[PDB]
Amino acid sequence: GGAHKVRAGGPGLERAEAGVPAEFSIWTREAGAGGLAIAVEGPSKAEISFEDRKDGSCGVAYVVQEPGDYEVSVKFNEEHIPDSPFVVPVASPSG
Amino acid sequence: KKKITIHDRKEFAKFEEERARAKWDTANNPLYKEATSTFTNITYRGT
């Protein structure tokens, strides 16, 4: 495993928009063997989707309908990574 | 560290044929506290 060597960052984990695919990235396959587990919290629905990348990274994303402050928890091998949970509010339509 | 986790990849495929049927919760659950159990390298390729 290596919940420490876990990668975590993205323009969606900081915040996003209501009704707008919130993207992000969490890489940790190099850290070592281990299963991925995360808690996606939010006062609205949420459709997860794994999209590939040119570098082969792993940027997952999800859309939300409730405008306001939502939040997605984060866990590796079932281990809350430092600074958890990750607070992530939804801003208003880019405008 | 390169298989012990994958070994748990098939335990799930069966653990579902074990209890069969299915299970889920929502509606009466305002906060969508869902999760995502992704397995190393999902169906689609990457490396």
Binding site: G1, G35, N77, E78 | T5
Partner: peptide
């Protein structure tokens, strides 16, 4: 794996006595 594997199963359920130790 690690503590994960057994408590890893997200599905909140544990009727059998929790082994651990």
């Amino acid at each position: 794996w690690k503590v994960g594997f057994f408590k890893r199963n997200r599905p909140p359920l544990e009727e059998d006595d929790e082994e651990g130790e």
